[PDB]
């Protein structure tokens, strides 16, 4: 599975993304600390996950799934965040059209403040289509999404959840 590191975790390892083996969230995280032990102190509190850390599987907080026991497929992606704080995060989504993201933002009560700019409670979401990816004769649009604000983490993951649909 792929592991995306944010904020503190990124600064502490020099890495933004890693590919690590594991059939459950726990297995992947145990391998993460075997690879970068500097993260052990912040990721685990005793045997379980540290209470202030947030781990998301395809946009879903794993705590509301099966936590460390959550099964995952080999190609799954996890997002790891240290204690919540105001910030800015970005991600490029494949085949996630602007109009569709807009519909989600509108359905969440977001207010349009410009073309590709929406304000949500505690965050501002900015998005623009970048260079499409080419797979054979198929052009796959790519959408760059940036989220910043006190609740940037929350909305950033809500968007990842939406895109997974």
The residue ranges that bind Cl ion (CB under 5 A) are 67-68, 108
- Residues 86-125 close enough to bind its own copies by CB under 8 A: 94-95
Task: Using CB under 8 A, count the residues that bind its own copies.
Answer: 33
Burial bucket for residue 24 (CB in 10 Å: 0-12, 13-18, 19+): middle
Provide, rounded to whole angstroms, the least separation between the CB of residue 49 and Cl ion. Answer: 5
SS3 of 39-53: the string is HHHHHEECCEECCCC
Is residue 47 part of the contact set for its own copies (CB under 8 A)? Answer: no
Residues 48-75 as b/e (b if ≥16 CB within 10 A, e otherwise) read: ebeeebbbbbbbbbbeebeebebebeee
Among 7, 10, 20, 144, binds its own copies (CB under 8 A): 20
Is residue 64 part of the contact set for its own copies (CB under 8 A)? Answer: no
Is residue 82 part of the contact set for its own copies (CB under 8 A)? Answer: no
Partner from Cl ion, its own copies, none binding residue 164, C-beta < 5-8 Å depending on class: its own copies
Provide, rounded to whole angstroms, the least separation between the CB of residue 102 and its own copies. Answer: 18
CB half-sphere exposure, 76, CA atoms < 13 A: 23
Is residue 58 part of the contact set for its own copies (CB under 8 A)? Answer: yes
- Cβ proximity of 73 and 67 under 8 Å: no
Burial bucket for residue 137 (CB in 10 Å: 0-12, 13-18, 19+): exposed
Minimal CB distance residue for Cl ion: 67
Partner from Cl ion, its own copies, none binding residue 108, C-beta < 5-8 Å depending on class: Cl ion
Task: Record the tokens describing residue 165, joined without a space.
Answer: 């649909």
Positions touching its own copies (CB under 8 A) are: 1-2, 13, 15, 18-23, 31, 34-37, 58, 72-77, 94-95, 133, 135-138, 140, 163-165
């Amino acid at each position: 599975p792929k592991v995306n590191l944010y904020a503190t975790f990124r600064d502490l390892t020099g890495k933004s993304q890693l590919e690590l083996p594991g059939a459950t969230v726990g297995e992947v995280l145990e391998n993460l600390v075997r690879a970068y032990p500097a993260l052990k102190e912040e990721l685990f509190e005793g045997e379980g996950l540290a209470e202030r850390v947030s781990v998301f599987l395809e946009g879903r907080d794993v705590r509301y799934l099966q936590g460390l026991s959550t099964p995952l497929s080999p190609g799954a992606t996890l997002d790891l965040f240290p204690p919540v704080a105001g910030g800015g995060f970005e991600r490029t989504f494949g085949a996630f059209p602007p109009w569709l993201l807009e519909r989600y933002l509108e359905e969440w009560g977001g207010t349009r403040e410009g073309e590709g700019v929406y304000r949500l409670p505690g965050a501002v979401v900015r998005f623009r289509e970048v260079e499409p990816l080419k797979v054979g004769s198929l052009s796959i649009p790519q959408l760059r999404v940036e989220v910043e604000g006190e609740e940037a983490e929350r909305w950033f993951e809500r968007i990842a959840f939406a895109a997974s649909r």
